[model samples]
Target: GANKTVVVTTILESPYVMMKKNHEMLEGNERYEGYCVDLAAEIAKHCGFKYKLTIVGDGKYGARDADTKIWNGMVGELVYGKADIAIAPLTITLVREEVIDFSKPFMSLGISIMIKKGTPIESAEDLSKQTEIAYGTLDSGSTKEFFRRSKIAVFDKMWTYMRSAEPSVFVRTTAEGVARVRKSKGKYAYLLESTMNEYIEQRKPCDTMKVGGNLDSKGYGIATPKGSSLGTPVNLAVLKLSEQGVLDKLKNKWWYDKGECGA
Candidate 1:
């Protein structure tokens, strides 16, 4: 087991795992960069294992199908033994916890709204009460599922509208949802994690802003198949990193040090 390389299932999300601008000239892990990439290195170092980072085949964080009872995306990769672990912006949810093991969260975040600068939206209630500004979440993600399963009056109402909205508010990727916000001319809003919403707000064009507080609070974890041996050490490593300020450093390194938006 020591000599066998660990296969890490990740996703191609910005400030997490992304292709290097000159990726074509690189090979393997060298072709990618971001917060998860650095976190992966720190983990492999402390855990004393080598890993190969591979993007999730389906490009999803992970979700279970209601009809087929089949798990898809990185969660599926772990459940079906396609990958040894996942190190991405994967959220910690009760449903995902039933099938996979997660390390204590490396980062904390919550569901937040992304809107084009100057949009009238100020809160979830604002969007929930208005029909003029349409909003939606990334399809097949924790954000959408939050809305779908929420019991709170505000979230339930928002979910009802998103589920039935015309022109299909669900987007397949975070980038797609961000693009929709940019192109909708203040008519569309996106529901996504606060971490991602904050990251995009600092990027070029600077036309998007995250308005209002998060709807819920949670953390992202490094996930493994249920009962894997690596679980304990990875969990410990996350705590160690947090205690040592490594996690905080990585956040500043990726989210602020490399930020494009002005102070």
Candidate 2:
């Protein structure tokens, strides 16, 4: 066999994919000891490939535009051949799916808000109609794109509300966007993955809370370059993981298992 190795590219998103505190001491593939870490193990096992995982050199930024916009970070990693596959909690939109082949959703989620505790806002309508708190989403990603291109009645209503906000609140990454919300002290609300929202709810600052129901949507999936040879194996790997309840287990452990956090 050829001495082939796949580059496993990942972003640094919390409760999903992130560098553990003592990552320096980790050895071999054990470097990924978190959700993505474990998911990668199963995926590799099922797909029957040997891989070397590495953080995106560009810091895992998501999609961007080519015309007056640039797709970089995680999207850049795949586009530029820095990584052979992607297993992050990547949302699958038609626009991105066209450029990157995505497997069936391994987790189900929808956009939600994280507001500081005691914030007067409680729902999407409240954020839109009442509170002075400015709300927005990660720039150039599915969440922002949803508001931009949606034509459905409800989405249209929400789009009008989000687009009309006076002081812009767009951010380049979900982590940066959420940190801004936490620091803004309720003046800013980040709209992002409900799954991530739940995970944060279990962490520090119980004062930070998620509001409103998730919009009906599928979950995250594995992504590969459009013509990458890894797509079939990756998709089948995810299917096996889902059927074995491994995907759900990881979700429950990270997002649902509050443990001693006592939330």
Best by lDDT: 1
Judge candidate 1 against the unseen true structure and give its global Cα lDDT, from 0 to 1: 0.95
lDDT of 2 at 140: 59
User: Per-residue CA lDDT of candidate 1, range 86-112, in tens?
Assistant: 999999999999999999999999999
TM-score for candidate 1, residues paired by index: 0.99
TM-score of each: 0.99, 0.88
lDDT of 2: 0.77
Candidate 1 clashing pairs, residues 3+ apart or interchain = none
Q: Identify the runs in model 1 with alpha carbons over 4 angstroms from their true place.
A: none
